[PDB]
């Protein structure tokens, strides 16, 4: 009986992987198992001796629509009326058959020109938001959910975020009256690592139920994924195994893939997932945003340079990506994305040069100059149509010197 919170050692007669053991005033998850020895992670904080009550099951949550309009934690435990129990389900879920899947082809317009035109978001599509520390990434999520989830359920999973982060989401849902059309799961910063990993697992377990069983379109936002990888590494360290790069576990990719892949489009409903992570040291090749980019169907990279130029949203047009974008973009829509990107890329290329060119590279330089000030820059409470976004591009082109 070794006790050092939140990790404990316990003698159990033939334990189970991921088994839930009820204690005096708390619970625990059996993470290790060899013969009659096992290691467990506590849900919160414990102190005294350890009568053990072995359930014989993994952590199962009830599935219903009681969650829609309430605030919960990483376990789905009620913080605000306990949900009806309620058909208990495995929080890990199952692997979705790709044969039954459907490639997203319906674009969800955000009202943001720096998104809709070049790299638009589609219904059911999984796409992340990469952001340097201190940049308005939270506002970027709240602005999206405001406009693409008007007729959808907004499931939000808070991963190891401070009280200033998740309450920024909560208060926004109340002011926009979308609090009752939402479900919030919050794992605190100093909360147990077992709670910071179950948070996106119970939020998607609900998302799969609402979308693919109750036939709905669900928008899921999560933050912070960097804290999630930090929580997983914490458990990987406790469970005596061999770590890898930066102490992170080897199964980091698959574990992050066991979340992002829990989203898509079916003939019944869809799950639009928008993961968010602050790149440690503003490095996109860091072990967390890199593997994330290897899974997510595109990403929205934020720019400190644009942020310093007081540009919201500070989205890098050339670094950002949307793989399934062209599956909803029409022949006219595809034209603007090419014209924008190519001229903006040749514009920034003409920005590094012609400093220390000809009339041609004079226009492209002015193009990228007018794009950041008018096209990219948008008020937080401003909605634009795809036609309006075209009107801006057509206006900028007519001023730069281009056709």
């Amino acid at each position: 009986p070794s006790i050092k919170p939140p990790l404990i050692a316990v003698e159990l007669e033939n334990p189970m992987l991921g088994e839930v053991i009820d204690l005096e005033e708390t619970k625990a998850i059996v993470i290790a198992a060899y013969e009659n020895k096992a290691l467990a992670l506590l849900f919160d904080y414990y102190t005294g001796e350890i009568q053990i009550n072995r359930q014989g099951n993994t952590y199962k949550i009830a599935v219903s629509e009681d969650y829609i309009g309430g605030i919960f934690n990483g376990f789905g435990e009620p913080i605000k009326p306990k949900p009806y129990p309620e058909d208990y389900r495995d929080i890990n879920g199952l692997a979705i058959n790709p044969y039954a899947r459907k490639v997203p082809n319906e674009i969800l317009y955000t009202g943001i020109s720096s998104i809709d035109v070049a790299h638009p978001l589609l219904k059911g599509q999984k796409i992340a938001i990469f952001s340097p520390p201190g940049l308005p990434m939270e506002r970027l999520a709240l602005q999206i959910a405001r406009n693409v989830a008007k007729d959808k359920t907004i499931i939000f999973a808070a991963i190891g975020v401070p009280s200033d982060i998740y309450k920024m989401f909560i208060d926004e849902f109340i002011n926009t009256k979308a609090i009752m059309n939402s479900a919030i799961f919050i794992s605190k910063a100093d909360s147990s690592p077992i709670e910071k990993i179950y948070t996106p697992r119970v939020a998607l377990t609900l998302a799969e139920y609402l979308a693919f069983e109750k036939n709905r379109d669900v928008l899921v936002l999560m933050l912070d994924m960097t804290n999630y990888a930090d929580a997983l590494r914490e458990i990987s360290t406790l469970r005596k195994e061999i770590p890898s790069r930066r102490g992170y576990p080897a199964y980091l990719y698959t574990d992050l893939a066991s979340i992002y892949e829990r989203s898509g489009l079916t003939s019944k409903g869809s799950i639009t997932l928008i993961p968010m992570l602050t790149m440690p040291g503003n490095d996109i090749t860091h072990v967390v945003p890199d593997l994330t980019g290897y899974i997510t169907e595109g990403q929205y990279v934020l720019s400190q340079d644009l942020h310093s130029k007081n540009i919201y949203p500070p989205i890098d047009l050339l670094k950002s990506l949307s793989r399934l974008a062209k599956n909803g973009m029409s022949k006219k829509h595809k034209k603007y994305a090419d014209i924008l990107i190519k001229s903006y890329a040749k514009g920034l290329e003409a920005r590094d040069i012609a400093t220390i060119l000809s009339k041609e590279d004079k226009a492209y330089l002015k193009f990228a100059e007018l794009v950041e000030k008018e096209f990219i820059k948008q008020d937080y409470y401003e909605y634009r149509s795809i036609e309006k976004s075209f009107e801006i591009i057509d206006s900028i082109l007519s001023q730069s010197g281009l056709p």
Binding site: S2, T47, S163, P243, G247
Partner: protein, 562 residues
Amino acid sequence: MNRIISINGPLVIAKGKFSIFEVVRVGEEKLIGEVIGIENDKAYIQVYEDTNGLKVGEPVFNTGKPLTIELGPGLLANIFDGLGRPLKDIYEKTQSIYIPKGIDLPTLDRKKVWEFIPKKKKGDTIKGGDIIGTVNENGFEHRIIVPPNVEGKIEEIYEGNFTIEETIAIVNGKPIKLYHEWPIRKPRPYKEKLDYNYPFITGTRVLDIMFPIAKGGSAAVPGPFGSGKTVLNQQIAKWADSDIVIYIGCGERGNEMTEVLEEFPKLKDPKTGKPLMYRTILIANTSNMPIAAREASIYLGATIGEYFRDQGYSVVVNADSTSRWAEALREISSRLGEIPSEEGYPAYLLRKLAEFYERSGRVRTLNDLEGSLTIIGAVSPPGGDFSEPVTQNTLRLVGALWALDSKLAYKRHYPAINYLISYTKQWEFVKKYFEELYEDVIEIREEFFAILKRESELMDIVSIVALSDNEKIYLHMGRIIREGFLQQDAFDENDSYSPLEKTIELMRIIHKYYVTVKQLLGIPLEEIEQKGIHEKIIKLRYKSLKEFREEIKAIEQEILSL
């Protein structure tokens, strides 16, 4: 019965019956420790003192209680350690300049006579966190708050002169003193979490304008040595708009703690006129002092900070530096024989750091009052590399970054706040204050950021020579902003503290200067700078009070380019 079986640095393994987080007395010398782990019949304990000389045949005594601290009058103008022990009394009881191991003395003065003036009456029902009365602690209204657990009516209640160990009132068959014990690892409970309303004035013209935070917020000041982490934080400990200031010298220079004792009673508060020491509480666990007490020092000042917060005041805590705390966690986790994570640090670094930075917050007290605990943490990354665990984990917990750049510290540009990477996620909470009491400040704030931005852009261009006059203007205005607004001599008698009246006027005088130069772009900038007006603006910050007001209305006359 209990006996040590293993001694490993600050870690000591004993053989006996123990509970978790239990205070113990190690050896026959009785060294204060705390149980952190349990291995069957054994218990892993960290010692907040030296363990060089301890035997294996030495016993370990129990206490039955957790690590606590005396919360009451007697903390102000005094310096303590990580365990909350008076460095004054130690010097007086031992008559030596050295700190002995195993000296256990009470935090507050036991013979001190306070004048308790009650605010409640006999027969009144009292809850938890309620203010039973006030005590004049050297000009401070120390509102005596009852422990959060007690409840009921007041049987008896007294008034007048008492000591810290005497009963002022008796409630429900239990005496109530002027002080109460509280576990430092257990945060003090509050009613509800309030929203940001008022900005956190620091007195520095960069932490108030460029990157300001709100009251009850959190920040981070990382950077290499020679940057000014200690100097800047002490300035925050000097001129903060706060009722209670706490400075935690966590594993740093002892002379930097002595500096506070020497220069604070001399200076006066720009709000009360009283010496800064009266509103200052020192926690001193230096680098040569026991490494285990580095952690305790963090949990100590945070708890004491929450104590004055529960009273209903403005509290600011400066921890310098958190990198020594992280080293302590690294050391302890290394002795325990646990798998290291990134850069040698333990895996639960972010979690432990979250146990400190989350204590900050403008909250509703247990007596329906508005308290505020603002936490400013200092980080010391190796080689000035911000891409490190301690820094990167803190960045995902705080609301702003006050990074110190080496290049600025190289050319002696103090404070060396890197006005490019540094940020603030609490500006939209504090923008209402400045806009309401000073219309044109966000107009100029963006302008200041723009000038500093393009100057950095043109700085990659300056490595060639030969520029447009519309480009040379930013190189000129950039020099004015840096030297005449960003730079702030902390040792100057009149530039150390800068009120908002002085700061905004500097923002106004540059804005008034900027709109003049842009209009003359039709004469060369060489003739504009020939007047030497820009040099007169730089010397503004070094001016006193009345002299500063007069030069402003002297430059405005030189502004007239008619």
